[PDB]
Amino acid sequence: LPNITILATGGTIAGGGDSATKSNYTVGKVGVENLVNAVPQLKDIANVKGEQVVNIGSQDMNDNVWLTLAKKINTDCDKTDGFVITHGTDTMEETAYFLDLTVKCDKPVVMVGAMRPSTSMSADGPFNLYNAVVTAADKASANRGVLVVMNDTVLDGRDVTKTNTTDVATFKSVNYGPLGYIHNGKIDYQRTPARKHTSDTPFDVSKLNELPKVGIVYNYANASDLPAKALVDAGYDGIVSAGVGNGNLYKSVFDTLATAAKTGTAVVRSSRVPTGATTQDAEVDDAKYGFVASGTLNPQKARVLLQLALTQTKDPQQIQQIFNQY
Amino acid sequence: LPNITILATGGTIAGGGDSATKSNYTVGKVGVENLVNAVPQLKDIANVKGEQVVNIGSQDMNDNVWLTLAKKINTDCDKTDGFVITHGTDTMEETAYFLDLTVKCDKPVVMVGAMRPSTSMSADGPFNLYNAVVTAADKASANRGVLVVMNDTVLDGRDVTKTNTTDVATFKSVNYGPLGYIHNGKIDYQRTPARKHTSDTPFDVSKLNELPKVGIVYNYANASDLPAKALVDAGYDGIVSAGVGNGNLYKSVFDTLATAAKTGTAVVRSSRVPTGATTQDAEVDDAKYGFVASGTLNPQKARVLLQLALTQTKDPQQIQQIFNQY
Amino acid sequence: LPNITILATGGTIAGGGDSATKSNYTVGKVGVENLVNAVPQLKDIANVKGEQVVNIGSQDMNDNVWLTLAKKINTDCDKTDGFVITHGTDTMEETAYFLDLTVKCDKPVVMVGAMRPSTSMSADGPFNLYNAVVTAADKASANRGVLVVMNDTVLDGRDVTKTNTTDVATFKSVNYGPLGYIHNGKIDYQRTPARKHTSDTPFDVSKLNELPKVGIVYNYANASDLPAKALVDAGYDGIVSAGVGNGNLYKSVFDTLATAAKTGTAVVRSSRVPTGATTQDAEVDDAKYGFVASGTLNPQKARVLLQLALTQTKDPQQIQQIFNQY
Amino acid sequence: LPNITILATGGTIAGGGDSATKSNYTVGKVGVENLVNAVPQLKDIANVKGEQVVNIGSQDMNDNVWLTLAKKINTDCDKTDGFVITHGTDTMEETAYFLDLTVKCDKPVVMVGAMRPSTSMSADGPFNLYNAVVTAADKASANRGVLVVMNDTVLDGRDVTKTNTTDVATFKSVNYGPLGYIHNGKIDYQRTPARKHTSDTPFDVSKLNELPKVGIVYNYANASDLPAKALVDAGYDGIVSAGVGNGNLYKSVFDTLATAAKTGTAVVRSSRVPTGATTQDAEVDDAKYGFVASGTLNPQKARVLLQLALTQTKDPQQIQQIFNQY
Ligand SMILES: N[C@@H](CC(=O)O)C(=O)O
Ligand SMILES: N[C@@H](CC(=O)O)C(=O)O
Ligand SMILES: N[C@@H](CC(=O)O)C(=O)O
Ligand SMILES: N[C@@H](CC(=O)O)C(=O)O
């Protein structure tokens, strides 16, 4: 049977409450060993090894953890046939894209979580974890980038996002769709991401202990420019605007970001709107102000790419080209 | 024929570019008179009167404009059979909910926009504006709250949101669905909002010249607490958190907001996730910290209700009850 | 505690396979007693009584079982506080609409099923059944018509349909949305159906032992008229066309159904397209041919309303009026 | 400038009504010359040549028109840089898949239609046709199989389906998503279909003047087996069942099709449910009965693949293999 390493970070898949039917719980309390032992069927499909990396709610995910995960995967690539990462669902879409750009291992890297705690009635985590190991053990899963497996579906790390606060079926690749569906332990793959990922990117975090500082500001009617000003005064390397509509900015925020771009802060226009691209050639003249349009990357994913872009260059033209290729 | 007043505020429905096939344009450049004259079919269904209120891109929408629109509608209620408001699509979902809570006129108030500029090939604005007048003239539309008409569909002001950056079909009521569909100028209504609206709310802005100051902060992996701190130091009356997952907060932001709530700042937990409710009884003990859970209101709509709540009370228990009724 | 009656009819909720991880299974093998004893927490929210009506896969649902169910609910209405019906998911949407038009009981009637068999890892039936009893016990559920509770959502019997062959989240009300969402045993209801239902219809099956015969034919490129002809030659009372697009018919099928409508067969145009209404006033002059347009009813739901209309009248004008009101 | 050939077949894109605001219209009345002259901007992006093949509503599409189209494209492949086919939207999804399996030309083949007639206010056909020519002229479009361009989106011919009866946004690839989105004349392609298409299939219709006869029967509660029986008695080569749920059949229809599969009729199980695969290994033992499971092909698309498979083989094992590869 294939050797599959489970790297555990916490999340509701490792969460517990006092009652099967009350909704209150805490995430990241159950160890990886107890996750594995609770699905004895794993032993028939894989030779499983579990490692606890951290045990937190992914609302508390941070750069230190990202860096650790990428180096761990790249270091151990040759010692296993695939990886499964258990993780909270709240920022899974961020971690998954970060690894999609920095992992240099060609073997399957599959992330998995649960929307209901392990103690819940009809808990979704056991069958998710099962399907994640199936996916990581399948030869067809290699070379597709970092993957997220939830609710019988295989999604790519770039497009996948959380679309509902509570539904087990919340994860969807809302612009370009999923890669495959799983039924009876077999995967019907009909798609693979076209944008460059993993060993095909120039991003290498093997020697880094810190990432550039990138913040996000939200736009809405009568938006305060105070959040944007605070990031600039604190010397942030980049700002991502969660803009309204097609990446548009409220007047005061636009003014602050235009000034910031001229003094060297990288600025990316994204959108609070959940689907579709923030494009060039709409209402904002990006070339005039030195802004970058994020394309289909939502604000939190645009932050991930901008941080990595900032380790290579500070030129907006160059950053735009990166946003057009990854 | 019925008397319908069009109150124009700008938007891409009044926007223009230099080419039918290039995507570049400016919003809010065409006067209301030219909008009306460009759809001569209006004259067969309604006695139309146009008034220009402002002419801006709704990315620049603000409290002054909201206040003006509500008082204008309430003042002129008895002089017309219905209202149509033309407006940019980027913040239409905010304005529509603000009017939904403050308009005291029982006659139909219908908002309408366009995703493609008036100069575009296959411009959607002419047929939208036609259907909006149809909806405002229909007796069945009364008493349903403020309405948004886009792409042959009648949506309620509370649930409606922009779901795509560029698609003509972008507006959807993503939690509870639309009220009606329009075909051949007739409306099949099968739903009406249950939450209290218009003349059934206690919100009255007739004597107000200013609203309480409410800002929004975004959460993501490694989120900065600097945006939250800046709002607090500037003495904001309320903050809305666009949280991850089911309204969760990154550790540093949670710390700052908990401290702020104890010194009197109203705090509401919402979610960057586009559908579903931010609930109580999940991972955050709202009663312990004095926080309010926003339910299905997304961050920008939760700001609208919080501002109005703050003109009546500062008690979190009371504000939670308001979030449970409106 | 409320008294709740569970009427069991079979389905995958009562289905079983030989392995927790293989997909093969048979439906309708587990008795109602075992279903209930498997969810001990029901006894905290209701006094439950189980009755086995039949035990089948709902792909074999038929008129005799529908008539039995309606009569049994109407007869026992005053002996209980609410009903839950366990049922397969394949024709759940048909039965729910049939009961929505023939149940004269004012108490909540809630249907529930499961997409995974009871022996499956992460089986969804136990939490669905728990939620269905919560909904049947909730006073706010009354007077909303017959309801389907699946995946934490409360759906009305008219609009609900199965949208995916295998997903636990397959049930959606795809035209007008759900009525309510359940979280921690509490239901946020924001909608109720406007079309008339249960006690407000004129359909009474108390004295009927059979229903009018109504069959469905499908349209596609180069469609055979043989299926249509076979139903007319057999003397069917009505035929529903699952048309292409907005209820259109392939030419040979058109000719056959136009002739049948003239010699007295009732003909309803519906559509194989999963959302949106089949309307009047498009490419087919229904008035000339005596055809009825089904509005948002899909073919299998149109068949339900046509059968019941045919117990009251055979006039196409009157039938159109029924399709406009229920 | 590229040379692009438009092959016109009719449809609402070529449809006309008496009023810009009434919904009534007839399809297939405007000639190709008038379609092209109505979009003068085409001459800036391509050298266009129009040919009228037929002029019908696509509800009357048939095998003879399919065979004509495939042969005409394969014959003229080397005389042009790309093809656009104008077509009604009702069976667009059928024709596109048929051409996807039989076109041996490597150049882009793009289908396009309109949901509103050309005389309608805000008619969508002109911008769709413009975008379809842009797509056919783009080098990046080649080798992606046959494409459907509607509402600024590029969809593959296998997964695309009509999801709504009247919405301009009705076309979606509901299982695996779209290939690309068009903005300002530029296409962001992120996906290509994995299933084999065009020159990589063994289907060759160059010498055929008819196709095997394959009909479709629908399942629902109390379904009549008469439609199935009529097609068997008439000697049909194959029957596709639009099954309930995951390809299930009402008992009488099951018995009839199991008997037909034994006396040589090819039987494919598909589903009336609009998304998801009909799988093996659920409730029906296909191997015992000689049935084929259609996977994500819906009934009208399964009929297309079954007809073409039947020109190569009659063995159900081989046919299953074809359904697994194309
Ligand atoms: N708050 C949890 C949510 C979950 O895992 O579902 C987390 O992200 O860790
Ligand atoms: N930026 C424009 C977008 C639109 O109207 O579509 C506005 O909101 O005014
Ligand atoms: N064939 C099963 C499917 C299910 O229940 O999910 C049934 O309808 O009875
Ligand atoms: N019946 C018309 C519908 C359309 O084109 O939109 C056709 O398919 O030809």
Structure description:
The structure is a homotetramer of 326-residue chains. The first copy, chain A, has two domains: 1-212, 3-Layer(aba) Sandwich (Rossmann fold), CATH 3.40.50.1170; 213-326, Rossmann fold (3-Layer(aba) Sandwich), CATH 3.40.50. Helices cover 27% and strands 21% of the residues of chain A. The first copy, chain A, has helices at 32-37, 63-76, 92-102, 125-137, 226-233, 251-262, 286-289, 299-310, 316-323, and strands spanning 3-10, 47-56, 82-86, 109-112, 147-150, 153-156, 160-162, 171-173, 180-183, 186-189, 214-218, 238-243, 266-271, 291-293. In chain A, helix 3 runs parallel beside helix 8 (299-310). Chains in contact: A-B, A-C, A-D, B-C, B-D, C-D. At the A-B interface, strand 11, helix 5 and helix 8 of A face strand 11, helix 5 and helix 8 of B. The complex binds aspartic acid (4 copies). One aspartic acid sits between chains A (10-12, 27, 57-59, 88-90, 113, 115) and B (245, 248, 283). Chains A, B, C, D: It catalyses: L-asparagine + H2O = L-aspartate + NH4(+). Chains A, B, C, D: Keywords: Disulfide bond, Hydrolase, Periplasm, Pharmaceutical, Signal. Chains A, B, C, D: Disulfide bonds join 77-105. Chains A, B, C, D: One of its GO terms (biological process) is protein homotetramerization.
